[PDB]
C-alpha cells in the first residue's frame, strides 16, 4: 500500500525543533510524484539522490522528520552547516542521503499577540551529533558558580521562544521543514517507488 | 537587509524630564530588540532587552515598548547620571552583524545662547611653511546644531575644513565649535577676503566674520 | 566579580600583526557567545567576530580571511588575532558576552588599536593672534603631530577660566591637528602675557609660545 506522507507535510500541529518529530516510514510504496511535482514548497534540496529519479529506487527505511524555524534558518537545515539549529537543534550528517523541504507556514504558524507555542534550544555546551535530539530543560551554567535547578544571572533556562508574529520580515517569519532521509541497511527493503 | 531609523539625533531635557526614543525597523523583527546606554570614553551598557524587560540593576525609571516595527525606550524621570547617548540593537538578524540604530544623544537644556565668532588668519610663521591654516571659533553656544560657511573671495567653500566641538561645558552647559580651513600658501595669496559665516538658533541672521590677506 | 578585561591593542604599521586578549572572571568564556565589536572614532559599534560555545566562528566581511577569533579554556580567555592590518582596522576593540534575544550585557572596558604608516612626529604650535578690533579671543594652533595625546595649558596653568582645548582631528595626511583657544578683557592684551604650553611626551616635545596681538 501507500506512505503515509500525508501524515507528516500535512499535519495540523509541527514540532518545536528541539523537539523536533521523527516518522519511521516502512512497508509501503511511495509515491515521490505527490513531492517534487509540487508548486507549493519553497525549499526542495537533495543530496546524494535525485528526487526525480526516486521512484526506480528501494530503501530498507525512510525517516521523515519535520519542525518549525525562522526563514532565516532553513539555510542550517543542510550537510555542514553551522548556527544555533544546527549546532544545537537539529543536525545533518555531512554524507547526508535525503532531502530538505520547507515552506512558509506564517499564515499558520504566527499569531497576532505571537505564537510562543514554538521553541529552539539556545544555550547548549557542544555540538549535537547527527540526528541527536536533546530533549532537557536543565539550567544553563553560562558562569563558574553552578546553578542547582535555580535560574538568574549566569544561570539560563536553555529553551527559548521565537514568538512568530504575522508582520515579520520573512527572515524572522515560520517555515515547515521536512527532512527525508533514506536509510540503506543489510535487511529486507520496505519502501519502494511507483 | 532590515534597516533600523532612531530619533530624534539629539534631544535637550533639564532634570526631571520625561524624556522617549524612537526607533523603527524597516520590517516585523517582532520582540527582537534591546537598548543600550554609553557615554563618552566607557563601553556601552545593556538597559532593555526583548523590546521590554529591564535588565537586572537598571533603574526602574527606564523602560522599553513596542513590537513589531515601532519601538520606544522612556525614562521617566531623567536624572543627572542619565545624560549620554542611547541605541537600540536589532537582536539575532541575518546576515550575522549586530544592527544599532544611529543613536540619540541627550544633552542638558538651558536657554539659547548666541556663538561669539572670531576669525584667525594664518600666522606668518606657519606661512614660511607652505601652509595656511584659517581658524574659525565658536565660542560658548546652545544648542549645539551650528552651521559655519567659509568663503573665500565670495566663494563657498567645501571639502577643505574639519570642524571640533567640545563637549558640554559642565558650568554653563554651552558648547564651543572651531573650524580649520587649509590651504596652500601659494592658494592662500591667491584672495584677498576670508569669512566665515555662522547661523545659528541665537543669531536673528548669519554672522560674518572676515579678514583681508595683508591688513 | 563579573567582568571582562582586554589587552594587547596598540600602534602598529599597515600590514602588521596584533593579538588582543579578554580575560574573563565570572562569564566562563567558553559556555558563552563571546563576540569581537569595535568601535572607530566618531562612529558606531561595527561587531568583528564571534565563537559559539560549541565551537562555531563567524566574522565581518570587512575581516574574513584577517582576523581569526579563538579562546583558551584552561585561561578564561578570549582572543583575537589580527593579521594583514589595515588604517580603516583602526577602533577601540571591545569583547562582550552575547545572550542573543537577552542582549549583550557583559562589555569590557576596550583596548585601543592605530593602524597607521604616519611617523612619530611633534608638533608644530602657531599662533591664534588677537585681532586689532569687551573681550577677545586668542589661542594656539597646535598642527602637524602624531600620535595622540597632546595637553595644552596657559601661563603654567595661572590662566584656566575660559579655555577651551579642542579634540583632536586627523587630517588626510594622518596626522593629528588640534587648537587651543581663551577668551580675555581686551583691555589685557597689552600687559598681559598668553603663552600656551604644548606637551607632546611621544615624541619629548616640550613647546612654549607665546600670543602677541598682531603688529601691522
Ligand atoms: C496534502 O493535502 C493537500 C490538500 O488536500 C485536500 O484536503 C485534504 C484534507 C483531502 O481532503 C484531499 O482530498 C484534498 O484534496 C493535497 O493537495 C491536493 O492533492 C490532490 C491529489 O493528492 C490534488 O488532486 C489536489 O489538486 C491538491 N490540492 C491542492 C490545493 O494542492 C496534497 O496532495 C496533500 N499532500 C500529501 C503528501 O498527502
Ligand atoms: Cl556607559
Ligand atoms: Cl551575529
Ligand atoms: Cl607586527
Ligand atoms: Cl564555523
Ligand atoms: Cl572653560
Redesign the pocket.
Known sequence: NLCP??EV??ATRFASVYAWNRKRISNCVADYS??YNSA?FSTFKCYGVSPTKLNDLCFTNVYADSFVIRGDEVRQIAPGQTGKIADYNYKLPDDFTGCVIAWNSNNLDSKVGGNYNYLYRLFRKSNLKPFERDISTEIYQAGSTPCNGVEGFNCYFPLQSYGFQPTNGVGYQPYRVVVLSFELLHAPATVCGK | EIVMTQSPSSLSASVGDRVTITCRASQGISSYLAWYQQKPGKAPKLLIYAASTLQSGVPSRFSGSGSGTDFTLTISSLQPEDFATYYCQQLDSYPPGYTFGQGTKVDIKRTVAAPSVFIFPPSDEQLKSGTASVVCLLNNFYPREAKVQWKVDNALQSGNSQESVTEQDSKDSTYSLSSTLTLSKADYEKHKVYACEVTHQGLSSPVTKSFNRGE | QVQLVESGGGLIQPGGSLRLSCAASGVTVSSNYMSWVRQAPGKGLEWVSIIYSGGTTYYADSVKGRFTISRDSSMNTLYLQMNSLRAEDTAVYYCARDLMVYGIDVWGQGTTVTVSSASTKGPSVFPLAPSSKGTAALGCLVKDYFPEPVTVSWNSGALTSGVHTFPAVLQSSGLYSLSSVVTVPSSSLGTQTYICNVNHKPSNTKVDKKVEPKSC
Open positions: 506522507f500525508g507535510f500535512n505527490v513531492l507549493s
